[PDB]
């Protein structure tokens, strides 16, 4: 408490460059995020894609998170036990790209983006642990 502490906790170990907690029910909004980065700018439309009925179209040509182009690697967001989607950003002209995990709780999405060279498994693991915690708390 409040939600900013969650961002402090997620960013503490230095492996992530961005982190967010986003309420996805009703009118979606960012509850907390790293200032001045990417997830802070996620839109209701982008949230709807993440959580929506269509689990196929985001393979034709990816999705965006705060305007940032990403490709979907694994989609288990709506699957019991997993509740996660892994992505990798797409860049123009070999600018670095980064792994992202989104996990889904009863009321939130937890989003994490790794720093350059950080493996998707570290990111996934962190994001999943925080989602598990939040679900145990009825969130």
């Amino acid at each position: 408490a409040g939600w900013n502490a969650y961002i402090d906790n997620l960013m503490a170990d230095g492996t992530c460059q961005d982190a967010a907690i986003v309420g996805y029910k009703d009118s979606p909004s960012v509850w907390a995020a790293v200032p001045g980065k990417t997830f802070v700018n996620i839109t209701p439309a982008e949230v709807g894609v993440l959580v929506g009925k269509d689990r196929s179209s985001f393979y034709v040509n990816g999705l965006t998170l705060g305007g940032q182009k990403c490709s979907v690697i694994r989609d288990s967001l709506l699957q019991d036990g997993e509740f996660s989607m892994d992505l990798r950003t797409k860049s123009t002209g070999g600018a670095p790209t980064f792994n992202v995990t989104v996990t889904k709780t009863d009321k939130t999405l937890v989003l994490l983006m790794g720093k350059e060279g950080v493996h998707g498994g570290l990111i996934n693991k962190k994001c999943y642990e925080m989602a598990s915690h939040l679900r145990r708390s009825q969130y």
Binding site: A1, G2, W3, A5, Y6, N9, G23, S29, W31, A32, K107, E129, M130, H133, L134, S137, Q138, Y139
Partner: peptide, 13 residues
């Protein structure tokens, strides 16, 4: 309207 209160954080290891 704004976000609900945040639950307590995980146990610090």
């Amino acid at each position: 309207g704004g976000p609900p209160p945040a639950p307590p954080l995980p146990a610090a290891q």
